[PDB]
Each structure stands twice: as C-alpha cells, then as structure tokens.
Write a protein that binds this ligand. Sequence first.
Ligand SMILES: *[C@](O)(C(N)=O)[C@H](CC1CCC1)NC(=O)[C@@H]1[C@@H]2[C@H](CN1C(=O)[C@@H](NC(=O)NC(C)(C)C)C(C)(C)C)C2(C)C
Ligand SMILES: *[C@](O)(C(N)=O)[C@H](CC1CCC1)NC(=O)[C@@H]1[C@@H]2[C@H](CN1C(=O)[C@@H](NC(=O)NC(C)(C)C)C(C)(C)C)C2(C)C
Lengths: 301, 301
Amino acid sequence: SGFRKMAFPSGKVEGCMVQVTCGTTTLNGLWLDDVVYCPRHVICTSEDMLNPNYEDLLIRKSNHNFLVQAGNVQLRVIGHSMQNCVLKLKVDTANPKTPKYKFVRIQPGQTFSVLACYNGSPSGVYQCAMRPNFTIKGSFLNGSCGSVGFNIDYDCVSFCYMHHMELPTGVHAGTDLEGNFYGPFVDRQTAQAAGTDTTITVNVLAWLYAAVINGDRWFLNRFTTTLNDFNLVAMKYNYEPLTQDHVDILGPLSAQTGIAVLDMCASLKELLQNGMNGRTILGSALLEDEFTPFDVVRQCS
Amino acid sequence: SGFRKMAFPSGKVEGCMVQVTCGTTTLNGLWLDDVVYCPRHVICTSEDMLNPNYEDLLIRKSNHNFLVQAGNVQLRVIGHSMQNCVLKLKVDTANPKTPKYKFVRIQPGQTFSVLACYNGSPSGVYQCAMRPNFTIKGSFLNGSCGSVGFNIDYDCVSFCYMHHMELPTGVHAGTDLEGNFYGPFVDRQTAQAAGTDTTITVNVLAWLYAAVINGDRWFLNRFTTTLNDFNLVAMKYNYEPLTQDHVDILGPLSAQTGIAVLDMCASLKELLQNGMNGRTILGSALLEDEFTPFDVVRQCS
Ligand SMILES: *[C@](O)(C(N)=O)[C@H](CC1CCC1)NC(=O)[C@@H]1[C@@H]2[C@H](CN1C(=O)[C@@H](NC(=O)NC(C)(C)C)C(C)(C)C)C2(C)C
Ligand SMILES: *[C@](O)(C(N)=O)[C@H](CC1CCC1)NC(=O)[C@@H]1[C@@H]2[C@H](CN1C(=O)[C@@H](NC(=O)NC(C)(C)C)C(C)(C)C)C2(C)C
C-alpha cells in the first residue's frame, strides 16, 4: 500500500563515480572497466565555453592534463578520446566495482533515477522523467555535471543520461552515455530555446491506475470516450496524443483493475475539464505524469 | 537549481540486507557485524499474530529454526535474543560490508530514506517523514517487513526505522532499531487507532525558503505576524504550533534569503487563508511538509 516516487537502489552506480579535473574545471566522471566517461567541456575555460572548438581545445591537451580521483586513489590516464559530447579517458586500472551494464538512449516520457554527485561523491538519488521537450526537471548545482541517470533490470545498470547544463528556466539538459544530447541542445554557452513542453498522457493514465490499485477511486465515472474524442480534449489541455500503442501498453494495468483504457480516458477528460475541486489523488493535487506504466507495475507489485 | 524529494545514496545499506525465514514466514533482516536484526513477528504463524505471547513463541524456537540468506550464501545462526519488538540473530560471520553506523530514535517531523526490500533484495529508495502521529506514508507491500529507514552523515549510516505493519488507512508503522515502536502501536493483529495527524509547520516554512532560493517568490508579501498570532491560524488549519526553537532552526535559511521567519509565517498564513488559486510552488499544488530545514540546506547547497 502507498505510492511513492521511487528511485532504483544506487549502490551499483555509487561504485562507479569518480572525480575528473582538467585545469581549474572539476566535475564528475563515470568509471566503467578501464574507461572514465565525463562531459567534454571539462577541457574548457570559462571563455572557451562561450564558443568552443572542442577539436582544437582537445588537440592541445595531454593525458597528464587530466586528473582522475577515485575516492582517495588517483587514477593514471593513459589515453583520451572524444565521442560526440563525452570525453573517454582510458585509465591504467579496471574498476573492480564495474556492474553488469549497458548504455541506452531513452525515449521521451521514460523515467530514470539520477545519482546527484559532487567532486565524485554521491549526494542523493531521485526519480526524473525525460520530458517531451527533452529536458529534465532535476536538482543540480554547480559541480553536478557528469552525474548519471540510470535504470536497473535484475543485475544490469542501463545508463541513459549524463548531466551537462542548466537552462534559464532552471531545467536541465544532457546526453546519453555515448555523448549525444537529448533534444536540440549543444554544449556551447549560447542562447538555446527549449521547445514548449507537454504533459505525458500515457503516464498520467498509468498513475490513475496506480491510484485505483491503492483505493483512490473518486475520479472514476461510467462514461467512456473514443480514442479520437479523447485526443481532441488532450490537444486543448497541452497533453500528448494517446496512440493505440499507448492503449496496448496500458493493457496489464487495465486488466488488473477491470477499468478499460478508454474508460480511464473518460475520467481523465473530466478531471481536465472540471479540475479536482479540492481533492487529491495519491497525495497530489496535480495530475502526475512522471510514472510510466512499468513504474506502476513495479511499485504496485 | 530545481528541488526534488531526494533520498540518500543507498549503497551502504544495500550491503546489509538479508533474508530471514522462520517456518512459512519470510521477511527482511539487517546484517550488521555478526547480528541480524528483524521484526520479532517472523516467529509467528498467522493465528499467532492475532494475540501473540512472544516470550512463549520464542522459547519454543531454536537456532536451526531461523534460516538467514545473504544473497546466495546461507548464514548459520549461532544465537538468538529478543529486544523489545526486534529479533537479534547472532550469526557465525561478520558482515564484511558493515558501514560505520549508529542506531537513532528520531523525533516526529524528521525525515529519512527508506530502502524497500523483498526477500532480502533491495527494490527501491524514497524519502519519508515521521508524521506527528508517528505513522509514515511509505510504499510497502507484503514481504517488505524488515526494510529500514536511515540517514547518512559523512560516512555514517544512522538507522532510525524498521518496518513492521500496515494500518487500515494504508499508512505504515514500525520501530527504531532497538525494537521500540514509534507511536502507540503494538505488533499484534488487533484494532489500533492512529492519532489525528497534523501538518509539520516548520517543514512547510523550510520548503517555502527552498522555493525562494530557487526563484519561486509569488507567495511573499510585505505583511508580518507575531509568533502568537500565527499559531492561532495554524491551530485552525490543523498545523502544528511553531515554537521559538523552530524559529531559531530556520535561522540560516532566513539569513540566506533575507526573509525574516515571522515574515515567511505571514506568507504561509495568507496561503492557508486564500489557497494558491491555480498556482504552484516547486511543482506542487499543495503545501509540502516532509522537507526539514536540514533537507533544504543539504539540497539547495
Ligand atoms: C557543469 O559542467 C559542472 N561543473 O557542474 C556545469 C553545471 C553548471 C550549473 C552552474 C554550473 N555546466 C556548465 O557549466 C555548462 C557548460 C557551459 C555553460 N553551462 C551551463 O550550464 C550554463 N548554462 C547555459 O549557458 N545555458 C544555455 C546555453 C543558455 C542554454 C550556466 C549559465 C548554468 C553556467 C556548457 C558547455 C553548456
Ligand atoms: C510483514 O511482516 C511482511 N512479511 O512483509 C507484514 C507486512 C504486511 C503487508 C501485508 C503483510 N506485516 C504483518 O503481517 C503485520 C504483523 C501482524 C499483522 N500485520 C499487518 O501488517 C496487518 N495490519 C494490521 O492488522 N494492522 C492493525 C493491527 C489493524 C493496525 C495486515 C492486515 C496488513 C496484514 C503484525 C504482528 C502486526
């Protein structure tokens, strides 16, 4: 019983966090086998970041320009390369705490846990969703760059995010672990517009199913809608369109609760048109959209 | 920038979680040095739990009645004792992953991270507050008993909660790590009334300071109140009284933001009397009360 924003246990990732220093710039790195991954702008001075040519900046760097600290132990860099927006520092020692892992590039609307780190030391863990506009609403201060986002499936850590930058609205942007940014952003200190964000409709529906599983039921009704009629209301309230693939994904939850997906859409439509009128769902006065259907099944086990 | 419900990194606790089986009952245990701590009702059958005499039930148990599994390895119990509502199983092996640790009994309104576990395997981590009525609003399913709550300060894990039971409202109750329940509850399957809960006033104020630190400022005003006048409004809205000790604790946050504690009380009073009128604070449409002043200082670092 109960429903919380639940992150994955962070131990397997904690053992991979290191500190990377280049000149006067210090941030976090991810130590897997004998490679340390970190944002490539660790090689930049502040005046470099305004319009950097990373090829030129890196060609002027040597292995001894990179100071990597794994706790108390300093790791010797024996090689460096650049992949997209990440820097790969080959080190002399294989991380003995390397878990079974993969790199994955996630789709918008998917969730992951973030291990916030500073100077290579983990500070906290929390859940985030990749927004439809490919930003994330994290909690990041100066020094958090290189912190990673991840999911776990049995004994495998799927890394999906590395933190690079903060947007003027206080939201955050970064890359997959192969250095490709999510969204249209670039690692250059220049005006960059984030797209207008939207609400992740399939996640709101999954969260409504979690509420029913936990006994929150006041929002249900006997009406129904068509998938096409629901999407016309969703468009008005800046919700993402619901597809039949979304309906199929919500299959197991609909079967467990006995509430057809299109029936739950009718209840969501009324919540959008009427509001909640002083009531709450799972302790929230807002419609919550950073729980995936998998997140609900996992926690409501 | 940003503000999230942030749990402590869970790695140090993950290495302590084991599985304890007694007959047909299986739950989680905490393995520290050569002792395994778990809820004492692991020795109960379902008909025992309706009105158990734990002294009689335990006197009929032997060491070989306790099956402890640490991952793949089975731990041999060489001794057992009962402390309040916890069972202490002495094992033949000292846990090599034992962190620096303490047992602490927390005050209501304090927060902690929970590592939800099933069959000795960590499932997720989230933040909880000890409610004024000494329940917690966790996320616990069958098999989660023995999961622990904790805080971390540098390299020391302060354990403060072990999970025992679910209340009919879906809220949760448990003990400190020395077996003393929080609140009036007992580990017996009998009607037990939880006290009427209240809102943790000092935490709401801390969260309002976090909002100002992050640029959420619409709720401020130029009014002020007296501590006595504020507490009269707090009593009407089922908020806990604010003490001068609470005011002193909010000192560092008030100094960082330049907003006097009693000035923030005036803004909270207006939020209570008027509502938020379709606005949000730190992404919430409700006044949030499970962030302590320490939680804010830690995350808004
Ligand atoms: C990390 O590298 C770190 N050391 O933790 C750092 C985190 C930020 C939080 C303040 C310091 N990231 C950057 O410094 C990042 C590097 C330059 C500029 N960066 C920013 O995050 C800037 N944002 C920004 O200019 N955003 C746009 C370009 C306007 C959209 C800050 C103004 C927040 C510093 C680069 C390469 C993007
Ligand atoms: C744990 O021991 C476990 N194995 O995970 C278990 C968790 C609950 C969640 C359903 C199983 N806790 C108990 O079984 C606990 C043991 C008996 C009864 N318990 C309950 O949690 C019951 N609650 C309850 O009766 N609450 C009161 C007494 C009405 C306030 C359940 C009805 C939820 C099983 C004891 C000793 C309290």
